[PDB]
Design a protein around this nucleic acid. Structure first.
Ligand SMILES: N[C@@H](Cc1c[nH]c2ccccc12)C(=O)O
Ligand SMILES: N[C@@H](Cc1c[nH]c2ccccc12)C(=O)O
Lengths: 373, 373
RNA sequence: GACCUCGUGGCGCAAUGGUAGCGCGUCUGACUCCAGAUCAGAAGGUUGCGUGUUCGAAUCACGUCGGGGUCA
RNA sequence: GACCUCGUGGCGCAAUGGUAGCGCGUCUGACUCCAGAUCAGAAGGUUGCGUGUUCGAAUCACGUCGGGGUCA
């Protein structure tokens, strides 16, 4: 697959080691999430500082986001949200979720209306993940921008402190780009500063922020961590995750356009099964005889990587890794297992989502004081 | 002085001729303002289209702005506002005034708080000009941005349609600039689109806008007029004004830093006099004998250019132009005259300004439906 | 305002008498426990528009829309 | 994260034994009805900070703050 240890060293982040994991445990009195245990969330930035504060009764809040590329979301999209929902429960902190409808409107051929609608439609599945209506604010850039005292003020502060060359260097823009993309990064940085949410943090400017996100989002926050000092704020802490594997392989890329690219949150019990069997890449030997002697390759097998994300029972996963690695299990049974797991899983989601009424999305997306004052 | 006819041809605007002036008269049933008569507002863009609509009962609104560089404003600053106040009265249309506190915060070493305060302090003199509290909305970018449904949405629409090279070309920015300056132009364009003021134009998107402004502001609107079609809107009409002359000469530049650079709205009866006599550049001959034979040079004489802006009585101005041009009047009397005019003028302002209470600035700057629904 | 330029078969790109190439691509059959490789086949709304000039125009002239590039 | 670089007398810029230049600049006197030109003079909080190494440091080493430039 891909070498994440090099990414870490490359970018400058830090590896999450057992020490850290154990701290999280001692600090939360709850067994750390399997993403932490199984290396899905492998890198971090300043997580110890976060823990130190937390353990010393100093408040911190969660910040994560979603780009509403489309109405169709897929299993891969849920990882950061799933983990964030867990972090919220376990630490009992408020959460802020950014729907970058304005970003997609900029990067894709979408109309302001479409973008927004996707931001709202997506809010449903994000909500379906179980976030506490009392301590989480899901917001649309297009909306919130125009109904906030602090948000825009921080963008302007952040923009006055980031040159085109910087973003050119970081994001690789070009003189040919729209001034809208050139300064969009400021918008994604802004929610890293508590006072961007006056109605929930009280013009407070030193509240620690922890940003769980996929490893590829880091550049935005590297730029953010960079400006913060320069503007009198504290830099956001980070917990990075690995990329979710496409059905065709860890290497290949997945889009909301290729439906056979991944399992979508709307797929049916039957579609789930079909996708795995007819598209999930394998690490299993060609002939079944070959497999029995050599055993599968757990490292490149998409189906197994999947279980790694959704088979919660730590022991059962092992039984599979073992019997699969040795050859005792044919990729056929493996896949069969992944389905037996995914089906009830997506079904579950689809139900929780249906319970999300319009008035619930409304509340979630309404800026207001949150439980933990 | 400077050749404005070349500016016109250069930029692509149009000269305001008697034909146009007479139309304005026929259309308003009021004698056109002396700025129009005396060539202070000399260039325009689509003014006839505006008139056509107006004469055919189609609504149009006024849009002009102010950069709150500082708390100290000077006579030169008032020209566009004076003329705008006249246009409002005469056509009876609503007006929108932009205080670019966010622009100064970006271009000058100011803090968000300072900028805003200047935006508010300046609002006072702008209000002191007589605008109708019922049909004019003075607003701060920093404020309004965060309390508007449409404004930000138009910036994003405008930004998705203006490349860095464009602004680089138009404004001459550089890769070295902050992403904040690079896309600031979108912000100044946005108020050219009625639906940026939903609470006053009702999500209406085709209301004609007329932007009175100093000739050097045009580039922003050339860029604006350019995007508009591309985003489904109508391009703003323009009425350009000449530059107000610095006390040292039409050529030299004036800043709120050099106090002897111009007559400031706070100066005293005595300071007024001092500034003219001790700094107002002259077109008068060296020796008084020389003057008597050659006569002054009305073209470069700052003091006379001043009367051109504030001596309202068309005939009296002539008496001066004549007796001065021939030599019958020494620049000494000329200057003496300019003072006798300016003193009561500034005094007046200072009083009107004092009547502007905090609750009045508040109302003006509060987004709300305006008289002409 | 003006001028320059580009405007493809789902995306990325090629100038008429022989099979318009695939970079990527999908769907069919075969072989494997699957998936991939491989082998054998099929299909895909074709020229941004509108007038033209020519025997013939994707390859030309005018107008037009959109992307990108340009001027104290 | 790291490294490169810059960090002036109101602004823009210059490497010790002779008057640290003015580009712009202000305020004084003179000459003109004024203003400007011109002529004659004066002044302006001086090295981003903090330690140092040296006889001597604006010109060097470490740390630091800020601007700008940099890396699959
Ligand atoms: N830019 C991310 C969404 C996002 C915005 N803010 C964030 C903060 C943390 C993680 C993700 C985000 C995307 O396109 O999906
Ligand atoms: N940018 C102008 C102010 C301004 C903003 N919007 C405007 C519209 C018309 C005229 C002036 C303005 C300035 O700096 O003074």
């Amino acid at each position: 697959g891909i070498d994440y240890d090099k990414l870490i060293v490359r970018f400058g982040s830090s590896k999450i080691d057992k020490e850290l994991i154990n701290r999280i445990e001692r600090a939360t009195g709850q067994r750390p999430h399997h993403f932490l245990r199984r290396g899905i969330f492998f890198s971090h930035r300043d997580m110890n500082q976060v823990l130190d504060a937390y353990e010393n009764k100093k408040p911190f809040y969660l910040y994560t986001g979603r780009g509403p590329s489309s109405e169709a979301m897929h299993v891969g999209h849920l990882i950061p949200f799933i983990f964030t929902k867990w972090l919220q429960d376990v630490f009992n902190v408020p959460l802020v979720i950014q729907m970058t409808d304005d970003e997609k409107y900029l990067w894709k051929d979408l109309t302001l209306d479409q973008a927004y609608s996707y931001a709202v439609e997506n809010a449903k599945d994000i909500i379906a993940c179980g976030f506490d209506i009392n301590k989480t604010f899901i917001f649309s850039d297009l909306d919130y921008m125009g109904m906030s005292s602090g948000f825009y003020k921080n963008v302007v502060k952040i923009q006055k402190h980031v040159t085109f060359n910087q973003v050119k260097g970081i994001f690789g823009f070009t003189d040919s780009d729209c001034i809208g993309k050139i300064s969009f990064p400021a918008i994604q940085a802004a929610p890293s500063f508590s006072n961007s949410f006056p109605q929930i943090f009280r013009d407070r400017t030193d509240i620690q922020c922890l940003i769980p996100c996929a490893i590829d989002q880091d550049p935005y926050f590297r730029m953010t961590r960079d400006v913060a000092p320069r503007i009198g704020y504290p830099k956001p802490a980070l917990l990075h995750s690995t990329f979710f594997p496409a059905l065709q392989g860890a290497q290949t890329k997945m889009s909301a356009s290729d439906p056979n690219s991944s399992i979508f949150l709307t797929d049916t019990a039957k579609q789930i099964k079909t996708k795995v069997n007819k598209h999930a890449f394998s690490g299993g030997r060609d002939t079944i005889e070959e497999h029995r002697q050599f055993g599968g390759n757990c490292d490149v097998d998409v189906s197994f990587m999947y279980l790694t994300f959704f088979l919660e029972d730590d022991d059962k996963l092992e039984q599979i890794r073992k019997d699969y690695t040795s050859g005792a299990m044919l990729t056929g049974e493996l896949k069969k297992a992944l389905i037996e797991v995914l089906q009830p899983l997506i079904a579950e989601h689809q139900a929780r989502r249906k319970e999300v009424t319009d008035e619930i999305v409304k509340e979630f997306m309404t800026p207001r004081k949150l439980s933990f004052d």
